[PDB]
Write a protein that binds this ligand. Structure first.
Ligand code: FE
Ligand code: FE
Ligand code: FE
Ligand code: FE
Lengths: 213, 214
């Protein structure tokens, strides 16, 4: 039951039903909105590995830490890592490296990131993972929608320009599954806390997308 | 200068000069003291990866996080990992798995671990790494001293029984160097904090070894 409630919260407040992606899917965003979005996502992208180490650092379940480590490796080890790939996507949108490093994250991005961190630094490890799950579980569907739109409306005829999304179509299937497993492995009579994180994260993500309209 | 001061603190309060290792090196510990020590280290061994993620999770320097990740991977990814290898050592001492899982960490072990964590969860990332450096920088020398003693006085004729130490002879050479680099990369006018962590950790380690001469 609680896993299902969790997934339902997400489905009922999924990012592909936000006006920003409804527009995306009909090709109704300007290049500027696209470049703004990409730049403003960068704070979250850089933070993501910290969301994971934050939970790892509070966790004494050895098997859970291994799984958290597996995710953290996928995000951050090697070259190109997920941050690198995101930077490529931004560059392929015509934003320069300098412009990317100079962008001041919007208040809406700072609030989204702080929402994630608040849960990953809190007393419930399971709720920490649910916060992350509530985002990662959406990315497989979003990534392939984003590819469809980049291709059909924004002229991305070269697949290496959307490598981040090609990566995430697949990678996050794995991460969602292992986060689900982590939630039941770490649960300690805090299923309510898991549910609350999901409500709070999904809303935050809506607050974030609101800011480009 | 401050890196030298750091290393001097460690040298002047190094674990091999604690009475517990002076005894070790002359073969003057009982098997019981040896099994006790090994069991009581386990809390720290399991905590170690958390020390590293704790700093990682507070760090926005991308290059520093990669290095922290590198250390974390070495400690905890794969099989056998460092925790697995330590379990093997304990088992090779004649302690059973059940006995290992049943050991209540001593108050001295809990204090050592809390000292490390306090620094790794604090406001200075550089001081966090220095806390870990103040331990890991000692392990190459200790590991080979421990091997020598296991071999010469405790009958370890089969090298797989001290794989943890064989691992650490080498691994921690790398980790010490990269922690050194991390400390200068993360420094923010908190060289004083770096020095204070080392004083505090070295002492805590002394407090921990003291507890087996009771
Ligand atoms: Fe990713
Ligand atoms: Fe992911
Ligand atoms: Fe190790
Ligand atoms: Fe190490």
């Amino acid at each position: 039951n609680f896993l299902d409630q969790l997934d339902l919260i997400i489905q009922n407040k999924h990012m592909l039903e936000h006006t920003f992606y409804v527009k995306w899917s009909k090709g109704e965003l300007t290049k500027e909105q696209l470049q703004a979005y990409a730049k403003d996502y960068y704070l979250h992208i850089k933070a993501f590995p910290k969301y994971l180490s934050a939970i790892h650092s509070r966790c004494d379940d050895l098997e859970a830490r291994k799984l958290l480590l597996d995710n953290l490796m996928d995000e951050e080890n090697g070259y190109p890592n997920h941050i690198d790939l995101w930077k490529q996507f931004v560059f392929a949108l015509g934003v320069t490296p300098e412009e990317l490093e100079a962008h001041e994250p919007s208040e809406a991005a700072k609030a989204k990131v702080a929402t994630f961190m608040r849960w990953c630094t809190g007393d419930s490890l399971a709720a920490g993972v649910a916060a992350l799950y509530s985002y990662e579980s959406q990315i497989p569907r979003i990534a392939r929608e984003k590819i469809r739109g980049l291709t059909e409306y924004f002229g991305f005829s070269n697949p290496e320009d959307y490598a981040y999304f090609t990566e995430h179509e697949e990678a996050d299937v794995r991460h969602a599954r292992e986060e689900k497993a982590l939630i039941e492995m770490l649960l300690k009579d805090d299923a309510d806390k898991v549910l609350e994180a999901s409500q709070e994260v999904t809303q935050s993500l809506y607050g974030f997308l609101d800011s480009f309209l």
